[PDB]
Design a protein around this nucleic acid. Structure first.
Lengths: 21, 88, 167, 185, 183, 75, 116, 117, 220
RNA sequence: AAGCUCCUUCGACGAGUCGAGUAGUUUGGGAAUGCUGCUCAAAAUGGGAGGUAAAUUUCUUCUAAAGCUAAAUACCGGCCA
RNA sequence: UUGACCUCGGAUCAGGUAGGAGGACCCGCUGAACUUAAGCAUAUCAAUAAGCGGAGGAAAAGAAACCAACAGGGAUUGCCCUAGUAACGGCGAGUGAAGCGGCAACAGCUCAAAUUUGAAAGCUGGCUUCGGCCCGCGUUGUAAUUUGGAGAGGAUGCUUU
């Protein structure tokens, strides 16, 4: 990957979450 | 029709995608002097130096295709004539 | 067709493909959802039993009963009833029920460690040499060209001193 | 008679075509080049201010590394690279500009004498991009520039600048505007 | 730096400097081979804005194409013919792009930027290694370059209704009788 | 203008196949009848070729002196 | 709005002299009909009555202009010896002759088929 | 309207229930990959363009940057926590802004965000 | 004397025939057919819409014209006609409704080119000031002067202006001479069958105050 | 190394390309519906496309001539079922 | 005399790559005629068949020089209706879309135009004891930063690896 992509993925990764009913 | 409260929008950075920049104007002016003129631009400039503005505009319109492009080219070459006389 | 006729009369074996799918149809692991996922139940029934929302969009068909998964003003300001220029960037500050829901809240609310970032040996030596000549005058340390080659501002050096515990 | 190879004939005919056509002034100005003595003086100064090779850079960095295991001023070098030198000329940081005369896509340098004239930086056209290349440890260099120097030879740089602006710029001043070439006669 | 000036110069192609340089180069190219390797781009600003890099694995190839009609006009562009001829000579390279460099009374000259997909300097760079994938084999033959994108009418709007997603796919979609199970 | 020299025979583009048998060639504005009235040679050849590729003959001075209308003033 | 006096004064700024005692008829070559062309057309929709009313107005104009040109002595009759170019190309008149002859043989073929 | 060779271009749909099963299994695979997460992203409420459909509203593409900033959700965190972002849309009025801001704070009120590690 | 008119008193009239950018085949054909009838008219096309309206006077100054006949096109369907005196005269904007050009193959008549036409007005063209201004602009536009050499010397057509509801229907008719039975003329129609709904009449060249406004017009 | 905030500092955006004329081809599509060949050949508070009789082209909405990208879609062929 | 540079070549030098097949589906180029219009030539057939070139498990398209006139929408693709409507046409044969609306699926990005200039920081090869050493590419520009509903530079104080 590029360094810009690596920085973005390092500091803003996909998060774990859940919407409660 | 329907009534809604209009907002004031954030200024678009895509607005004026031409050039209000002074550096591009500087580069355009420098290249013009270095490169020289096209043959049709030289004919328009030799008509404008003789005062035959009507013929110059017709020649520019014929060789450019639009009255607006002809007007812009004639103003540019008249400006070149003005700075050439000022340097003279 | 000629190829298939050839293999029918050939003694070469028929290579049977296993039914290997690219994507698994059931969650797996040692997390909370994996131990409570029923493989014989659909997505909507499983998320109903968890107490979670499966689809955040508009309902697209009828659902089974008990679905529960397919979800003064001085200045005229529409946003002043909405309240509770910089915000926290890397997280949110969010302030009977099914057991999976409570387990998810419990594991999301449990305290975690921070792994506080330390300082290098050379940075500590630089901050130490900076203290040994001026003491507390952070303005003089910023002015110093010899001991502070990168001309850092006194606020940055004060913050670094506070992190080092050198005040 | 005998037959010459094709590319040699192309080279010689490109010579004759580039020297015997009516060349525009922006291209015809590049036929007027510094003399031997002034180029020698300029290259003495620029050889005093050459950059470091790869071996000296790694050697120096190893020296600082082991000094840290067991204070400096800003380095002063000859500035090179076309876009870098153009940016230095535009920001009026360059003090003297040396432009090579044999850049094969000559468009990369035709605006450079006019640009140096407009921003007021003294310039001179030198013989050989390979010469400028040897100075900066590269094969070729389209243009080099000097911006500022160490104290001990500032005066020398100033004299060199004055030299070119008395020895090259006024000898070019009238012929920089005229078309070159032609077969009249 | 200098590329801004070269872009402004390239925008005045009948001025004295550019006309003189174009004529001298046209004379030299006319006496060279039809498809010949160019050591460096004659228009570096144009090649650089089209994705050419001074890196091992990038190649320029100049090509002359006979100009004029095929009153049946060839619906294929002369620039597309140039890329196809160069792509056959260099069958191991991928055509990245191409651009006009010169024109004569009987020929139009174009320079084609090609990329070697087997060089390690290209395979390791995430900005160009998309061309290493086998779906980009002979982009010039399938209308996948810039000229191909223009000639296939791949633009957004009401003016490009029948061609914006492919003309033949749109025609097959409009000429298909869809019969469902419950009619 | 394309109408500075307008002819006095008042026709456009029919050929002379009309009015051949008749002694005239048309009328006029008033309506009167207009009668019919009755170093080395090879290198120089290369130079002249590429020069003829670069001769603008529509201008009185094709090779004028450069006037520095922009670079005369200093930034 | 109808700022009438403005229209009269603007006409005066751009009027040329039209008076039969001063300027001859050939100068303007303009004749105005006496009938107002609203009584001759009862309804607008029928094309025949509207076209014959316009025909009546232009016939009145043609008669009075012919009389005034005969008084003036300016030539009016285009003679057969005068050949000039045409408003539309002779291909177009070939086409209109072609439809006239086509409908002529269509009508006569219908008549002959009724006779046969 | 059978002037052309329509025989070679008849599309039947005997695979309609099989494609429905395939779509449901694809949704199940999305559920397996994103185990506590919903399979869909949050989308804003937008008004239908024309005068015929002006009365009703529907789901949009993504939330405006002003709507996200007003709701207190940073721009870079929003796609990683299930919210869709559209940089082309503009609010143009104080009534779509308030509606989608209310939608975003309602989403924030019912969200269980887990720490990174 | 370069006036190109040989007469006692010269009627120095010049027309500039112009079309906008989004004109149709029908509008272009009407332009070609109408400009063919005027020797003192010059044809140019594709005027820029975003440009100001008074720039039309500058375009006319280039060709020494004092009349402009502008073909403005909207949506690629609607045709608006501008009749204006160029330096300081009034402007009449019109809407063209039904077009039938000369290429239409049912007319069966034709006339010379530059024959000085008989301009047939209606009796409403004097009993109303706005129709008087339109009448005189129609005279100054459609009327060929005396000594303009490019004109034909034998007249054979009358151009018909008639006001029926609130609009000006314009026609053209060809003189045909037949001997009287013991000579009279009949008319055979040539070309453009088109209707002009008046919209506005201004005082300036292409601006100025509004003098006449038609509060009946229902736009397409 | 990274995100955000602030501002007595700056902010470069693709040319034998748009466009004009013309000949083919194509489309439901003369604002040529698109494309191509020939001739001429641009701009910089610019350019493109729309709205509008509304008093003059007011207004609206986007940035062409460089490039990558999964999914939903097709499938008389391949490995099977 | 000697050594650079540039350009054009040779080598059974070292490392690679292309060709053919298949072609149901896909992307281009080229391109008919029968037939219908109770004859037939515009038209239709059909931008189809045949022919030629080029890929993949899908391809293509794709993150607006878009749609719209709205209280606005918001990359591409496909299904439903739009709709046999608009539009065009020996206005005959007929040909024949698209916006909106409901749905399936959703994901965004990389460059060029900047001086790293207080340090070409970048990369292909060869030799290896595999740890780091040489030649070369490249300043006519290889890394980092930035991609216009943006951005940079300073300051600032929190929050991230």
């Amino acid at each position: 990957v590029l360094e810009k992509t690596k920085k973005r993925l390092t500091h803003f990764p996909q998060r774990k979450y859940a919407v409660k009913a | 029709g329907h009534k809604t409260t209009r907002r004031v929008l954030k200024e678009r950075p895509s607005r004026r995608k031409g050039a209000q920049s002074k550096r591009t104007q500087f580069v355009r002016s420098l290249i013009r002097e270095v490169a020289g003129l096209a043959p049709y631009e030289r004919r328009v400039i030799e008509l404008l130096r003789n005062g035959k503005d009507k013929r110059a505009r017709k020649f520019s319109k014929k060789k450019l295709g639009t009255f607006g492009r002809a007007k812009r080219k004639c103003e540019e070459l008249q400006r070149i004539i003005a700075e050439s006389r000022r340097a003279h | 067709r000629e190829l298939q006729k050839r293999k029918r009369r050939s003694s070469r074996p028929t290579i049977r493909m296993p039914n290997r799918r690219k994507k698994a149809l059931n969650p797996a692991g040692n997390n909370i959802i994996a131990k409570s996922w029923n493989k014989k139940e659909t997505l909507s029934q499983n998320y109903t039993r968890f107490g979670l929302v499966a689809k955040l969009g508009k309902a697209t068909g009828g659902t089974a009963p008990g679905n529960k998964a397919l979800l003064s003003e001085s200045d005229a300001v529409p946003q002043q009833q909405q309240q509770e220029n910089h915000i926290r960037q890397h997280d949110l500050e969010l302030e009977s029920k099914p057991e999976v829901l409570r387990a998810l809240e419990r594991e999301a609310t449990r305290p975690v460690e921070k792994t506080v970032r330390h300082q290098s040996e050379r940075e500590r030596e630089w901050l130490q040499r900076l203290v040994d000549k001026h003491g507390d005058d952070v303005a003089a340390m910023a002015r110093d060209r010899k001991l502070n080659p990168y001309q850092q501002t006194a606020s940055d050096i004060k913050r670094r001193l506070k992190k080092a515990g050198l005040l | 008679m005998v037959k010459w190879p094709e590319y040699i004939r192309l080279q010689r005919q490109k010579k004759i075509l580039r020297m015997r056509l009516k060349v525009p002034p922006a291209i015809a100005q590049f036929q007027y080049t510094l003399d031997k003595n002034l180029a020698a003086q300029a290259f003495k100064l620029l050889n005093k201010y050459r950059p470091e090779t790869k071996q000296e850079k790694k050697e120096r960095l190893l020296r600082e590394a082991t000094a840290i295991k067991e204070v400096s001023k800003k380095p002063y070098t000859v500035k090179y690279g076309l876009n870098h030198v153009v940016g230095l000329i535009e920001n009026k940081k360059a003090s003297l500009v040396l432009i090579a005369n044999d850049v094969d896509p000559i468009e990369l340098v035709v605006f450079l004498p006019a640009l140096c004239r407009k921003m007021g930086i003294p310039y001179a056209i030198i013989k050989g991009k390979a010469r400028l290349g040897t100075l900066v440890h590269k094969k070729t260099a389209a243009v080099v520039a000097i911006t500022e120097v160490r104290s001990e030879d500032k005066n020398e740089l100033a004299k060199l600048i004055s030299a070119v602006k008395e020895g090259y710029l006024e000898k070019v001043e009238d012929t920089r505007k005229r078309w070159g070439g032609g077969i009249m006669g | 730096g200098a590329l801004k000036y070269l872009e402004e110069l390239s925008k005045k192609k009948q001025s004295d400097v550019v006309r003189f340089l174009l004529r001298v180069r046209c004379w030299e190219y006319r006496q060279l081979n039809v498809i010949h390797r160019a050591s460096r781009p004659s228009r570096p600003d144009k090649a650089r804005r089209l994705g050419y890099k001074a890196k091992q694995g990038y190649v320029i190839y100049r090509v002359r194409v006979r100009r004029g009609g095929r009153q049946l006009k060839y619906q294929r562009s002369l620039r597309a013919t140039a890329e196809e001829r160069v792509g056959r000579r260099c069958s191991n390279l991928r055509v990245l792009n191409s651009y006009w460099v010169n024109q004569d009374s009987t020929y139009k000259y174009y320079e084609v930027i090609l990329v070697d997909p087997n060089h390690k300097a290209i395979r390791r760079d995430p900005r160009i290694n998309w061309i290493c994938n086998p779906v980009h084999k002979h982009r010039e033959c399938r209308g996948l370059t810039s000229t191909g994108k223009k000639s296939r009418g791949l633009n957004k709007g009401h003016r490009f209704n029948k061609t914006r997603a492919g003309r033949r796919k749109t025609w097959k979609r409009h000429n298909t009788l869809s019969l469902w199970r419950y009619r | 203008d394309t109408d500075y020299n307008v002819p006095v025979n008042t026709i456009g583009n029919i050929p002379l196949s009309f009015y051949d048998s008749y002694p005239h060639i048309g009328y006029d504005i008033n309506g009167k009848k207009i009668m019919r009235p009755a170093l080395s040679r090879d290198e120089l050849e290369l130079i002249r070729k590429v020069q003829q590729g670069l001769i603008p003959d529509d201008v009185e001075d094709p090779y004028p002196d450069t006037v520095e209308w922009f670079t005369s003033v200093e930034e | 709005i109808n700022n009438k006096e403005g229209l009269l004064t603007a006409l005066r700024r751009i009027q040329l002299d039209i008076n039969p005692k001063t300027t001859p008829f050939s100068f303007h070559q303009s004749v105005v009909a006496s009938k107002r062309t609203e009584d001759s057309i009862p309804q607008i929709e029928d094309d025949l009555q509207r076209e014959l009313a316009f025909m009546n107005q232009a016939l009145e104009a043609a008669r009075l202009g012919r009389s005034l040109l005969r008084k003036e002595g300016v030539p009016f009759t285009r003679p057969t010896d005068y050949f000039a170019e045409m408003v539309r190309t002779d291909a177009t008149m070939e086409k209109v002759k072609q439809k006239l002859i086509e409908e002529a043989t269509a009508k006569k073929a219908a008549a002959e088929a009724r006779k046969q | 309207h059978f002037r052309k060779h329509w025989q070679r271009r008849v599309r039947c749909h005997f695979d309609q229930p099989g494609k429905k099963v395939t779509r449901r299994l694809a949704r199940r695979a999305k559920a397996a990959a994103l185990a506590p997460r919903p399979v869909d992203k949050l989308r804003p409420i937008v008004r239908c363009p024309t005068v015929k459909y002006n009365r009703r509203t529907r789901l949009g593409r993504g939330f405006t940057l002003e709507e996200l900033k007003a709701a207190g959700i940073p721009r870079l965190l929003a796609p990683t926590i299930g919210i869709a972002v559209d940089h082309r849309r503009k609010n143009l009025s104080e009534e779509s802004l308030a509606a989608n801001v209310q939608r975003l704070k309602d989403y924030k009120a019912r969200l269980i965000l887990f720490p990174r590690k | 004397d370069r006036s190109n008119i040989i007469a006692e008193r010269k009627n120095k009239q010049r027309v500039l025939v112009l079309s906008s950018r989004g004109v149709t085949y029908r509008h272009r054909h009407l332009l070609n057919d109408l400009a063919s009838m005027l020797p003192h008219g010059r044809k140019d096309a594709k005027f820029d819409t975003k440009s100001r309206l008074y720039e039309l006077c500058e375009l006319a100054e280039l060709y020494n014209c004092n009349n402009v006949l502008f073909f403005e096109a909207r949506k690629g369907k609607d045709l608006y006609m501008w009749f204006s005196k160029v330096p300081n005269g009034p402007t009449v904007k019109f809407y063209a409704q039904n077009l039938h050009t000369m290429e239409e193959l049912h007319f069966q008549g034709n006339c010379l080119k530059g024959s000085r036409p008989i301009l047939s007005f209606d009796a409403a063209f004097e009993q109303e000031p706005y129709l008087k201004v339109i009448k005189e602009l129609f005279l100054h536009t459609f009327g060929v002067p005396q000594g303009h050499k490019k004109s034909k010397p034998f007249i054979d057509h009358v151009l018909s202006f008639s006001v029926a509801d609130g609009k000006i229907w314009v026609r053209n008719y060809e003189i045909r001479e037949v001997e009287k039975v013991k000579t009279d003329i009949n008319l055979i129609e040539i070309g453009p069958r088109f209707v002009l709904t008046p919209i506005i009449i201004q005082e300036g060249s292409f601006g100025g105050p509004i003098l006449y406004e038609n509060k009946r017009f229902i736009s397409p």
